[PDB]
């Protein structure tokens, strides 16, 4: 019973195709039979210019639940990224991505992606999801920035 989620996702797809930030990618995956799987989207976030993430194209998957948009979509970087707020599994979280926090119907895919992009260069040090990136970020910012640049190059188109 995901008809309600599918009706919205179909409109979000059209809206995204009509207008979305340059460099960003958000497309539903395909089912084995060739039809669209609107519950599972393949996305890509370009590093923000002027930052150490520049030049990189970071891929992530957006998974929607049958009760969407009551619940937020689950976002996971594939592969997992070196970042304080990116879990080892690649899962990335934001206040607007938490049902019990700032998630709400007014939230769009464009908002989520831009929100995650902003997070990449401006980590949330109070709520890390990874111990490794958080540790280096706090103990040696220069080294942290270095790891980020290398990662940005590795993920350049």
């Amino acid at each position: 019973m995901s008809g309600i989620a599918l009706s919205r996702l179909a409109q979000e797809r059209k809206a995204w195709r009509k207008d979305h930030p340059f460099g960003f990618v958000a497309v539903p995956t395909k089912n084995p039979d060739g039809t669209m799987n609107l519950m599972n989207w393949e996305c890509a976030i370009p590093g923000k210019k002027g930052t150490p993430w520049e030049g990189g194209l970071f891929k992530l998957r957006m998974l929607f639940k049958d009760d969407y948009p009551s619940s937020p979509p689950k976002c996971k970087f594939e592969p997992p990224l070196f970042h304080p707020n990116v879990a080892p599994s690649g899962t990335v979280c934001l206040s607007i991505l938490e049902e019990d926090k700032d998630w709400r119907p007014a939230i769009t895919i464009k908002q989520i992606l831009l929100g995650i992009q902003e997070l990449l260069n401006e980590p949330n040090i109070q709520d890390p999801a990874q111990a490794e990136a958080y540790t280096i970020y706090c103990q040696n910012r220069v080294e942290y920035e270095k790891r980020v640049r290398a990662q940005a190059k590795k993920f350049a188109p």
Binding site: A87, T91, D127, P128, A129, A131, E132, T135
Partner: protein, 157 residues
């Protein structure tokens, strides 16, 4: 005479001692150290009965050393996963899954203080442990004494 399963089910200083003078070997022998999550559980259950008293302190420390030596000695055991799950269970690092909330952090902190000084402990983990033990947290604040000791020890690693 008591058994490991009963001790782990309902840990108590007395039950640990009732395991016998070989309790340390028994805890490790009966624990599936191939599974990081299981090692974390065993470690927390054992450390939860720590008391600043001769017999109990020795029993907990020896049990921890036997368990963690066995776990870390396997070239396959992922020490980083152990650390990550340990922090999650201690309520110091967020996670996707739901975990029980540990009441007293005194035992776990004092057990770690001892562990980080042993030869079997991978030094690469010290910086991460320190970053999360120094990070603001209500639970750690209530156990300042243990917290300060562990940090002072981590500084010397």
């Amino acid at each position: 005479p008591a058994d490991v399963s009963t001790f782990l089910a309902f840990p108590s200083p007395e039950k640990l001692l009732r395991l016998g003078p070989k309790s340390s070997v028994l805890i490790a022998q009966q624990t599936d150290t191939s599974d990081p999550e299981k090692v974390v559980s065993a470690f927390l259950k054992v450390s939860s009965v720590f008391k600043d008293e001769a017999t109990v302190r020795m029993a907990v420390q020896d049990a921890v050393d036997a368990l963690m030596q066995k776990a870390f000695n396997s070239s396959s055991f992922n020490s980083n996963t152990f650390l990550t799950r340990l922090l999650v269970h201690m309520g110091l690092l967020k996670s996707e899954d739901k975990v029980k909330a540990i009441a007293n952090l005194y035992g776990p902190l004092m057990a770690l203080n001892h562990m980080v000084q042993q030869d079997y402990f991978p030094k690469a983990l010290a910086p991460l442990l320190l970053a999360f033990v120094t990070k603001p947290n209500s639970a750690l604040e209530s156990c300042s004494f243990a917290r300060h000791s562990l940090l002072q020890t981590l500084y010397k690693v």
